[PDB]
RNA sequence: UUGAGCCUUGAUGUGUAGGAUAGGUGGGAGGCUUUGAAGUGUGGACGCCAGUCUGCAUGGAGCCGACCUUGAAAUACCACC
């Protein structure tokens, strides 16, 4: 299945560990080893029911460092995806992007949402491995 | 032993347009390749038997992304599932 590069992408990052917000921003430099400039996509598994139309989260947040206001909306399962800019942006720069997104999701808390909201926040680059933040 | 929760990993998913036994969504267009390649001998899993996956290796270093038909993009690539 996997090959020379794709194995090392999962060997560098410990899958069975949820890193801190100060750790995932700098570790993603090892994953991006492409010719071009990649971008970081954020996967947030919202604790909402996608089969209920009254709990849909829809909105847009302003990225302090651009890519650059982005738009987002969850799928028919519960996980919402949006980018927070390029990978060549500094680690502290992506720190500002990620925290502004997390507050934005909490600024659109559904009224009928019963349960813990996020329970897992994960980010990944274009050639990135599974990296979750606290 | 035999069931279930669950970690890692790996496969699975053809109304119909159709080169795809392509679920939604999604970031980006290079990955791939001599940390030993396309095609094939032959064997296994799966199988709605349509066509994917895949052990060894002669061989021996090439394959392929937006492009095109689609409501959707190409497990070339990854992430959440």
Coordinates of C-alpha atoms (C1' of nucleotides) in Angstrom, one line a residue:
Chain A
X1 CA 0.0 0.0 0.0
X2 CA 2.3 2.7 1.3
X3 CA 5.7 3.7 -0.2
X4 CA 9.0 5.4 0.8
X5 CA 7.6 8.8 1.6
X6 CA 4.1 8.0 2.9
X7 CA 5.4 5.6 5.6
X8 CA 7.8 8.3 7.0
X9 CA 4.9 10.8 7.2
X10 CA 3.3 8.5 9.8
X11 CA 6.5 7.5 11.5
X12 CA 7.5 11.1 12.4
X13 CA 4.1 11.9 14.0
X14 CA 3.0 9.7 16.9
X15 CA -0.6 8.7 16.0
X16 CA -1.6 7.7 19.5
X17 CA -1.0 11.2 21.1
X18 CA -3.0 14.4 21.0
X19 CA -0.5 17.2 20.9
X20 CA -0.9 20.6 22.4
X21 CA -1.8 23.7 20.4
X22 CA 1.8 24.9 20.8
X23 CA 3.2 21.6 19.4
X24 CA 1.2 20.9 16.3
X25 CA 2.0 24.3 14.8
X26 CA 5.7 23.6 14.5
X27 CA 5.7 19.8 13.9
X28 CA 3.9 20.2 10.5
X29 CA 7.2 21.4 8.9
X30 CA 8.4 17.8 8.7
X31 CA 5.3 16.6 6.8
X32 CA 5.4 19.2 4.1
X33 CA 8.2 18.1 1.7
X34 CA 6.6 19.0 -1.6
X35 CA 7.7 21.3 -4.5
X36 CA 4.8 23.8 -4.0
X37 CA 3.4 25.7 -1.0
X38 CA 0.7 23.6 0.7
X39 CA -2.1 24.6 3.0
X40 CA -3.5 23.4 6.3
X41 CA -7.1 22.1 6.5
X42 CA -8.9 21.9 9.8
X43 CA -11.2 19.0 10.6
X44 CA -13.6 19.7 13.5
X45 CA -16.0 16.9 14.5
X46 CA -18.9 18.9 15.9
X47 CA -21.0 17.3 18.6
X48 CA -24.2 18.0 16.6
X49 CA -26.6 15.7 14.9
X50 CA -26.5 16.1 11.1
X51 CA -30.0 14.5 10.8
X52 CA -31.5 17.5 12.6
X53 CA -31.9 20.7 10.5
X54 CA -32.1 22.9 13.6
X55 CA -28.5 22.3 14.7
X56 CA -26.7 23.3 11.5
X57 CA -23.5 25.5 12.0
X58 CA -23.0 27.9 9.2
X59 CA -20.9 31.0 9.1
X60 CA -17.5 32.6 8.2
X61 CA -14.5 33.8 10.2
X62 CA -11.7 36.2 9.3
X63 CA -8.2 34.8 9.2
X64 CA -5.7 37.2 10.8
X65 CA -3.0 36.1 8.4
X66 CA -4.9 35.2 5.3
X67 CA -4.2 32.3 2.9
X68 CA -8.3 36.0 3.4
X69 CA -11.8 35.3 4.9
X70 CA -12.9 31.7 4.5
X71 CA -16.3 30.1 4.5
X72 CA -17.3 26.8 6.1
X73 CA -20.3 24.5 6.6
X74 CA -20.5 21.0 8.1
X75 CA -21.3 17.9 6.0
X76 CA -24.2 15.4 6.3
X77 CA -22.3 13.5 9.0
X78 CA -21.1 16.1 11.5
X79 CA -17.5 17.1 10.6
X80 CA -16.8 20.6 9.3
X81 CA -13.7 21.4 7.2
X82 CA -12.0 24.7 6.3
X83 CA -8.5 26.0 5.6
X84 CA -6.5 28.4 7.7
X85 CA -3.8 29.4 5.2
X86 CA -0.6 28.1 3.7
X87 CA 1.9 25.8 5.4
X88 CA 4.8 28.2 4.9
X89 CA 3.2 30.6 7.3
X90 CA 5.0 30.7 10.7
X91 CA 4.0 28.3 13.5
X92 CA 2.9 31.2 15.6
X93 CA 0.9 32.5 12.6
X94 CA -1.1 29.3 12.3
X95 CA -1.6 29.6 16.1
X96 CA -3.6 32.7 15.6
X97 CA -5.6 31.2 12.8
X98 CA -6.6 28.0 14.7
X99 CA -7.7 29.7 17.9
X100 CA -9.9 32.2 15.9
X101 CA -11.6 29.3 14.2
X102 CA -12.3 27.4 17.5
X103 CA -14.0 30.5 19.0
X104 CA -15.9 31.0 15.8
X105 CA -17.4 27.5 16.0
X106 CA -18.3 28.3 19.7
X107 CA -19.8 31.6 18.5
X108 CA -22.4 29.6 16.5
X109 CA -23.4 27.1 19.2
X110 CA -26.7 25.4 18.2
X111 CA -29.6 25.9 20.5
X112 CA -30.6 22.2 20.6
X113 CA -27.1 20.7 20.6
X114 CA -27.0 18.3 23.5
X115 CA -23.5 17.0 24.3
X116 CA -19.8 18.0 24.3
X117 CA -19.1 20.2 21.3
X118 CA -15.8 19.3 19.7
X119 CA -14.2 16.3 21.6
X120 CA -11.5 16.2 19.0
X121 CA -9.8 19.0 17.0
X122 CA -7.4 17.9 14.2
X123 CA -5.4 19.7 11.6
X124 CA -3.4 18.4 8.6
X125 CA -1.5 19.8 5.6
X126 CA -1.7 18.6 2.0
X127 CA 0.9 15.8 2.6
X128 CA 0.1 15.7 6.3
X129 CA -0.6 12.9 8.8
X130 CA -3.3 12.7 11.5
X131 CA -2.5 15.4 14.0
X132 CA -5.0 16.3 16.7
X133 CA -4.8 19.3 19.1
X134 CA -6.0 19.8 22.6
Chain B
rU1 C1' -11.2 -21.3 22.5
rU2 C1' -15.7 -18.4 21.4
rG3 C1' -18.7 -13.4 21.5
rA4 C1' -18.5 -8.0 22.5
rG5 C1' -16.2 -2.8 23.8
rC6 C1' -11.7 -0.6 22.0
rC7 C1' -6.0 0.9 19.9
rU8 C1' -2.8 0.5 15.6
rU9 C1' -3.0 -1.0 10.5
rG10 C1' -5.5 -2.6 5.9
rA11 C1' -9.6 -3.3 2.6
rU12 C1' -14.5 -2.2 1.6
rG13 C1' -18.1 0.4 -0.9
rU14 C1' -20.7 -1.1 -9.9
rG15 C1' -29.3 3.2 -10.4
rU16 C1' -27.7 6.1 -14.1
rA17 C1' -23.7 9.5 -17.7
rG18 C1' -19.4 6.1 -18.2
rG19 C1' -12.0 4.8 -19.4
rA20 C1' -13.4 4.0 -12.6
rU21 C1' -16.8 -3.4 -8.1
rA22 C1' -16.1 6.2 -8.2
rG23 C1' -20.2 7.4 -0.1
rG24 C1' -20.3 12.6 1.5
rU25 C1' -17.1 16.5 2.1
rG26 C1' -12.4 18.5 1.4
rG27 C1' -6.8 21.2 1.1
rG28 C1' -4.3 21.5 -3.2
rA29 C1' -2.1 20.0 -8.4
rG30 C1' 2.2 17.3 -8.0
rG31 C1' 3.1 12.9 -6.3
rC32 C1' 5.1 8.7 -8.3
rU33 C1' 10.3 6.1 -9.3
rU34 C1' 16.3 3.1 -9.1
rU35 C1' 15.3 3.1 0.7
rG36 C1' 15.4 -1.6 -6.9
rA37 C1' 10.0 0.4 -12.2
rA38 C1' 5.4 -0.4 -16.4
rG39 C1' 3.4 -4.5 -18.3
rU40 C1' 2.6 -10.1 -17.1
rG41 C1' 3.6 -15.8 -15.4
rU42 C1' 1.1 -17.8 -11.4
rG43 C1' -1.2 -17.9 -6.3
rG44 C1' -4.4 -15.7 -2.4
rA45 C1' -8.6 -12.2 -0.2
rC46 C1' -13.2 -10.0 -2.0
rG47 C1' -16.9 -10.5 -5.5
rC48 C1' -23.9 -7.7 -6.7
rC49 C1' -18.6 -12.6 -10.5
rA50 C1' -19.0 -6.2 -13.1
rG51 C1' -13.6 -5.5 -12.4
rU52 C1' -10.4 -3.9 -8.1
rC53 C1' -6.8 -5.6 -4.7
rU54 C1' -2.3 -8.4 -4.4
rG55 C1' 2.8 -12.6 -2.3
rC56 C1' 7.7 -14.0 -5.4
rA57 C1' 10.2 -12.5 -9.6
rU58 C1' 12.5 -12.9 -14.7
rG59 C1' 11.8 -8.1 -16.2
rG60 C1' 14.4 -4.1 -14.6
rA61 C1' 13.4 2.3 -13.7
rG62 C1' 8.6 4.0 -15.3
rC63 C1' 3.4 5.6 -14.0
rC64 C1' 0.3 9.7 -14.0
rG65 C1' -3.2 15.7 -11.5
rA66 C1' -6.7 19.7 -12.8
rC67 C1' -8.0 18.7 -18.4
rC68 C1' -13.0 14.9 -20.3
rU69 C1' -18.7 12.6 -19.9
rU70 C1' -21.0 13.6 -14.1
rG71 C1' -25.3 15.9 -9.0
rA72 C1' -19.6 14.6 -7.1
rA73 C1' -14.0 14.2 -7.8
rA74 C1' -10.2 11.4 -9.6
rU75 C1' -7.3 6.0 -2.2
rA76 C1' -1.6 10.4 -8.5
rC77 C1' -1.9 12.8 -2.5
rC78 C1' -3.7 13.4 2.5
rA79 C1' -6.8 14.5 6.5
rC80 C1' -11.8 13.7 9.4
rC81 C1' -15.0 9.6 8.8

